[PDB]
Amino acid sequence: ANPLAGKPFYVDPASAAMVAARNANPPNAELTSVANTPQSYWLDQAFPPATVGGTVARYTGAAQAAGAMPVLTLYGIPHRDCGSYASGGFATGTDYRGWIDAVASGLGSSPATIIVEPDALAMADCLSPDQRQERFDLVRYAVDTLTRDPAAAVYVDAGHSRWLSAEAMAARLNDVGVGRARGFSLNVSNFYTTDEEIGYGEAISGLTNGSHYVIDTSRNGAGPAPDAPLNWCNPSGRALGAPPTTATAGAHADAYLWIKRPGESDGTCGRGEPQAGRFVSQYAIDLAHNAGQ
Ligand SMILES: OC[C@H]1O[C@@H](O[C@H]2[C@H](O)[C@@H](O)[C@H](O)O[C@@H]2CO)[C@H](O)[C@@H](O)[C@@H]1O
């Protein structure tokens, strides 16, 4: 059955969006809307192996106390973003493995939804063959270790419908043990329509023994900006998409989620914009305004 059905997704009470909505003077309808919508909580190399267990236990326990399903995104892979606007990740595979162990320790047997490494498999060809193999091994390690929490619904990130082909991505998913996870994620931090992503997801599902998927609908209400380089990097004219739900239109689509947090910058984007991940109230307002709110 769909592990995501049956309770609301957790609204993070401490998100930058909540802080902005509470501080708004006068109150702002767009910030409030965004702030009250459940998103995902992103963890990376700022949360070292030594302590991330406690961070995870705290967040999943808080979500359980709220009667809700926490969504956590892991974004610590070595050579992350191939050193572009969202550069970072742990220094080595050894560090990354210790990080995954600590995250798993914090999960215990608690309910959680885990999005594993946005872009990692899709971007892997920027690496040398040896480094690419290591990356696949690390994503497979995440799957094998995290799924030891029976109550973790694990979705390995699989890019989007205009990145790798369904066949190419399915090969990579099968290589990293997608069969042990619940499935895969699509459209993370991107803008493609839900319909387009459903067709792509059902194709990958067909090639991965019926695996299930989630789609990031945080910013896809108006589809993507015109085809261009960096059309994914703080594009204007985009809108909030469907709020998180399990009432989807795909046979193997477990949920629409907001994985990316609306309002956060995608990077400097060659325009001196705020660093990737920094909350920009104006960006959240624009996305909400464009959706008619
Ligand atoms: O999808 C968000 C993700 O996009 C990355 O760029 C991709 C792009 O999405 C794809 O359409 C194009 O064909 O390939 C590039 C990479 O070569 C971007 O680099 C990431 O930061 C971002 O998270």
Name all domains of the chain by residue range, CATH numbers in brackets. 1-293 (3.20.20.40)
Spatial separation of the C-alpha atoms in residues 176 and 144, rounded to whole Å = 9
Cα 184 to averaged position of ligand 1 atoms, centre (Å): 17
Per the DSSP assignment, residues forming a β-bridge with 43 are: 74
Cα 6 to averaged position of ligand 1 atoms, centre (Å): 33
Q: Tell me the H-state helices in the chain.
A: 16-23, 29-35, 49-65, 93-107, 129-146, 166-175, 194-206, 281-290
Please name which of 65, 70, 144 lies closest in space to residue 107, comparing C-alpha atoms.
70
Quick check: 105 and 53 in contact, CB under 8 A? yes
Does the annotation mark 119 as catalytic? yes
Quick check: 192 and 160 in contact, CB under 8 A? yes
Please name which of 246, 196, 189, 247 lies closest in space to residue 218, comparing C-alpha atoms.
189
Task: Supply the angle between the helices 166-175 and 194-206 in degrees, to the nearest 10.
Answer: 50
Q: The tokens 């789609």 sit on which residue?
A: 215
The widest CA-to-CA distance across the chain, in whole angstroms, is 55
Spatial separation of the C-alpha atoms in residues 39 and 73, rounded to whole Å = 10
Q: The tokens 């009250």 sit on which residue?
A: 36
Does the annotation mark 216 as catalytic? no
Written as six digits, the tokens of 271 are 């325009």
Which of the 8 DSSP states describes residue 124? G
Does the annotation mark 286 as catalytic? no
Nearest CA to ligand 1 atom 20: 81
234 Cβ below 6 A of ligand 1: no
44 Cβ below 6 A of ligand 1: no
Tell which one of 115, 119, 238 to mutate to probe ligand 1, the residue whose CB is within 8 A of the most ligand atoms. Answer: 119
Written as six digits, the tokens of 82 are 């191939």
What Å distances lie between residue 187 and 123, 217, 221, CA to CA? 14, 8, 12
Q: The tokens 């709110």 sit on which residue?
A: 293
Per the DSSP assignment, residues forming a β-bridge with 255 are: 214
What Å distances lie between residue 87 and 42, 121, 195, 284, CA to CA? 14, 16, 30, 23
Spatial separation of the C-alpha atoms in residues 66 and 96, rounded to whole Å = 30
Spatial separation of the C-alpha atoms in residues 213 and 193, rounded to whole Å = 15
Cα 85 to averaged position of ligand 1 atoms, centre (Å): 11
Written as six digits, the tokens of 187 are 């459209």
How many other C-beta atoms lie within 10 A of the C-beta of residue 25?
6
Residues 28-43: b if buried by 16+ CB within 10 A, e if exposed: bebbbbbbebbbbbbb
23-27 long-range contacts (CB < 8 A, ≥24 apart) are 24/281
Nearest CA to ligand 1 atom 6: 232
Cα 8 to averaged position of ligand 1 atoms, centre (Å): 30
Spatial separation of the C-alpha atoms in residues 39 and 178, rounded to whole Å = 23
185 Cβ below 6 A of ligand 1: no
Elucidated via = X-ray
Spatial separation of the C-alpha atoms in residues 187 and 220, rounded to whole Å = 9
Per the DSSP assignment, residues forming a β-bridge with 257 are: 216
Written as six digits, the tokens of 36 are 């009250």
Q: How many helices (H) and strands (E) does the chain have?
A: 8, 7
Quick check: 43 and 103 in contact, CB under 8 A? yes
Q: The tokens 């082909």 sit on which residue?
A: 165
Residues 213-242: b if buried by 16+ CB within 10 A, e if exposed: bbbbbbbbbbbbbeeeeeebbbbeebbbbb
The experimental resolution of this structure, in angstroms, equals: 1.8
Spatial separation of the C-alpha atoms in residues 261 and 243, rounded to whole Å = 12
Quick check: 103 and 57 in contact, CB under 8 A? no
Q: Which residues does 139 contact at the CB level (< 8 Å), separation at least 6? A: 77, 116, 117, 120, 121, 156, 176
191 Cβ below 6 A of ligand 1: no
Per the DSSP assignment, residues forming a β-bridge with 143 are: none
The radius of gyration of the chain from alpha carbons, rounded to an integer in Å, stands at 18
Tell which one of 44, 117, 123, 261 to mutate to probe ligand 1, the residue whose CB is within 8 A of the most ligand atoms. Answer: 123
CA torsion through residues 28, 33, 37, 43, sign: negative
> Of residues 149, 216, 254, 266, which has the active-site annotation?
266
Spatial separation of the C-alpha atoms in residues 68 and 110, rounded to whole Å = 11
CA torsion through residues 141, 252, 72, 89, sign: positive
Per the DSSP assignment, residues forming a β-bridge with 155 are: 115, 183
Which ligand 1 atom lies nearest to the CA of residue 122? 16
Spatial separation of the C-alpha atoms in residues 112 and 149, rounded to whole Å = 9
32 Cβ below 6 A of ligand 1: no
Task: Say if residue 26 is preceded by a cis peptide, omega within 30 of 0.
Answer: yes
Q: Which amino acid belongs to residue 130?
A: D
What Å distances lie between residue 245 and 8, 38, 259, 270, CA to CA? 8, 10, 12, 35
Quick check: 91 and 41 in contact, CB under 8 A? no
Cα 10 to averaged position of ligand 1 atoms, centre (Å): 27
